[PDB]
From a paper:
In all three independent copies of the complex in the crystals, AFF4 residues Leu34-Ile66 are ordered, binding to the second cyclin domain of CycT1 opposite CDK9. Consistent with the coupling of folding to binding, AFF4 lacks intramolecular tertiary contacts as it snakes across the CycT1 surface. CycT1 Trp210 adjusts to create a site that buries AFF4 Pro38 and allows a short antiparallel β-sheet to form between AFF4 Tyr39-Val41 and CycT1 Asn 209-Glu211. To accommodate AFF4, helix H5′ straightens and residues 251–256 form a helical segment that packs against CycT1 helices H1 and H2' and forms part of the AFF4 binding surface.
Recent studies of gene fusions in myeloid leukemias, as well as complexes recruited to the HIV promoter by the HIV Tat protein, uncovered a family of Super Elongation Complexes (SECs) that bring together active P-TEFb and other transcription elongation factors.
Numbering used by the authors:
A (entry chain G): 34 to 66
B (entry chain B): 8 to 257
C (entry chain A): 8 to 88, 97 to 330
The structure:
């Protein structure tokens, strides 16, 4: 029913950019979540 | 009744604590500390996240009626957790909680005598406060959390542990650092947490094979504006928090 | 001290103590402004050891969940200025009191209606993953208008079917002795809805016998009375009953045949009635009829059809 989520191209978004700063880098903090 | 424990920004601004001259940001801070304390105690008492979550919601709701002036967050949190533990069928002995509360609030002093006066007094102060919480909440103890909806959804859209665990993580964070539990229904908050985890993690959920966006399988009111609007509000609330070592740490 | 969502019980006027209770426990009352008849149940706090009774929190959580025509209705929760009361919609009668009253007469058609409401009520609670765990005539209420209601959820808990790898370990010593199913007397902790329906069977028989059919004095005497009525407890009729630690450690009569129908025949007579009872009082909980099947059993769909109770309750 649902295709599998896919890694989007590096976001040029203003939201994705802001989030990367408000929470830190995902690939770095990922292993702690 | 349905819209009883949900408030507008006006109602949140005009809180009981505001009535006694507490900065909006200072009240937000008080809540964040109570949650942090609830989370700490919870992990020590060894209760599930669900138990903590509930206690946190009890707390958020408690302070839409009572003031931080009249009720310290450090007195209420233990009582709230004590109550939540019973409600969620993970009851912890009254002694156990008061001790653990001391371990968190006073890592210094010797665990007071269990036969002394100042202690027996704490046992009553907590039991009393539990009773006040119950009355303040109108004995409405059954809480619905975003986590339930987050899981059911990430299951549906075949998310990786990577993404699923991050969404779940964001859910817990929303209870800690924001008052979304007082503003938006759990299903909506779940969508915000997923949408956020996706942006952060760079995953994108396709449209289903029935031409319906993933959030439509969680809540029929959610739109992409709302997801952007609430994600914005979320990030905004985070920006205002003092040390964001609170996010990634506990 | 603001408290908008918990009203003072003063709003009701107390009229009487109901059921020769224990103390100032349950009162019949009326709203001072609307005249609404209610029943106030004071939350007992003799066991003040561990704060507000967790066992009471349980009851309230469940009462607030269960909203159905044949389940007692929790209106609200009131305080004093401390004590706490659970406020219910008043119910004039209770099945125990009715069957104790010699002047009360139940027609076959009316007994059908009673059992039908009772079973429809059980279907609802089990559907919402709840176990009553204290079935008995005393806990079956009926209103003046003839609507049956299940009551006393102070013993009830929620139940899950998960996780298919580890069984649930619930409180074993539950349900009044006289209404307790065999599986519980044998020491079962992984049980479910079937325990409530065994109770329903005991109650259905009471509708005719007018008294609890199996009044034991000890857990094992109860098991003995069950054997005398339902037949001996053997793996042949209850597969994998050997696994109960107590199956061997309990002196169990070995020769007993099944006498359920033969014994109640004198009281009941109607074949369909005897049959449904025979299916409710089944030793093997896995082979015991459930709520849904019971409600579609011929008993409820053969003459005389079930009828309302209003008329029969004025006497
Ligand atoms: N409407 C009522 N009238 C009289 N007694 C009631 C009523 N509802 C509940 N009770 C009694 O209150 C106790 C708790 O009932 P429950 O709320 O079902 O746990 C039991 O002893 C019931 O028989």
């Amino acid at each position: 029913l649902f295709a599998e989520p896919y890694k989007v191209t590096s976001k040029e978004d203003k939201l994705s950019s802001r989030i990367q700063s408000m929470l830190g880098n995902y690939d770095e903090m990922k292993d702690f979540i | 009744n349905n819209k009883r424990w949900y408030f507008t920004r006006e109602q949140l601004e005009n809180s009981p604590s505001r009535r006694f001259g507490v900065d909006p940001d200072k009240e937000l801070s008080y809540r964040q500390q109570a949650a942090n304390l609830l989370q700490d105690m919870g992990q020590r008492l060894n209760v599930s996240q669900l138990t903590i979550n509930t206690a946190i919601v009890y707390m958020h709701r408690f302070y839409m009626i009572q003031s931080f002036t009249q009720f310290p967050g450090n007195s209420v949190a233990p009582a709230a957790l004590f109550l939540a533990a019973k409600v969620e069928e993970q009851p912890k002995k009254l002694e156990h909680v008061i001790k653990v509360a001391h371990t968190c609030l006073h890592p210094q002093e010797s665990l007071p005598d269990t036969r002394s006066e100042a202690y027996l007094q704490q046992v009553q102060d907590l039991v009393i406060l539990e009773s006040i919480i119950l009355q303040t909440l109108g004995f409405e103890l059954t809480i619905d959390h975003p986590h339930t909806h987050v899981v059911k959804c990430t299951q549906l859209v075949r998310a990786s542990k990577d993404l699923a665990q991050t969404s779940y993580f964001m859910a817990t964070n929303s209870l800690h650092l924001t008052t979304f539990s007082l503003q938006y229904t759990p299903p909506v908050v779940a969508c915000v947490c997923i949408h956020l985890a996706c942006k952060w993690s760079n995953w994108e959920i396709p449209v289903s094979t029935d031409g319906k966006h993933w959030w439509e399988y969680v809540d029929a009111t959610v739109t992409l504006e709302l997801l952007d609007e609430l994600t914005h509000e979320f990030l905004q609330i985070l920006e205002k928090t003092p040390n964001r070592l609170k996010r990634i740490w506990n | 001290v603001e408290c908008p969502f918990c009203d003072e019980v003063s709003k009701y006027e107390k009229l009487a103590k109901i059921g020769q209770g224990t103390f100032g426990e349950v009162f019949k009352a009326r709203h001072r402004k609307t005249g609404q008849k209610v029943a106030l149940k004071k939350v007992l706090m003799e066991n003040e050891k561990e704060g507000f009774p967790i066992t009471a929190l349980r009851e309230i959580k469940i009462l607030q969940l269960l909203k159905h025509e044949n389940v007692v209705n929790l209106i609200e929760i009131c305080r004093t200025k401390g004590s706490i009361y659970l406020v219910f919609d008043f119910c004039e009668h209770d099945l125990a009191g009715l069957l104790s009253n010699v002047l009360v007469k139940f027609t076959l058609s009316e007994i059908k209606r009673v059992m039908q409401m009772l079973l429809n009520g059980l279907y609802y609670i089990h559907r919402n993953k709840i176990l009553h765990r204290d079935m008995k005539a005393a806990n079956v209420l009926i209103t003046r208008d003839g609507v049956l209601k299940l009551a006393d959820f102070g013993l009830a808990r929620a139940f899950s079917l998960a996780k298919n790898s580890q069984p649930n370990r619930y409180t074993n010593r539950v349900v009044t002795l006289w209404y307790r199913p065999p599986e519980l007397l044998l020491g079962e902790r992984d049980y479910g809805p079937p325990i409530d329906l065994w109770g329903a069977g005991c109650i259905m028989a009471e509708m005719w016998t007018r008294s609890p059919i199996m009044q034991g004095n000890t857990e094992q005497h109860q098991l003995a009375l069950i054997s005398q009525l339902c037949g001996s407890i053997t793996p042949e009729v209850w597969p994998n009953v050997d696994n109960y630690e107590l199956y061997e450690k309990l002196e169990l009569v070995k020769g007993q045949k099944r006498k359920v129908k033969d014994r109640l025949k004198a009281y009941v007579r109607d074949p369909y009635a005897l049959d449904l009872i025979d299916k409710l009082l089944v030793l093997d909980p896995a082979q015991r009829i459930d709520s849904d099947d019971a409600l579609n059993h011929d008993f409820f769909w053969s003459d005389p059809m079930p009828s309302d109770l209003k008329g029969m309750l004025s006497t």
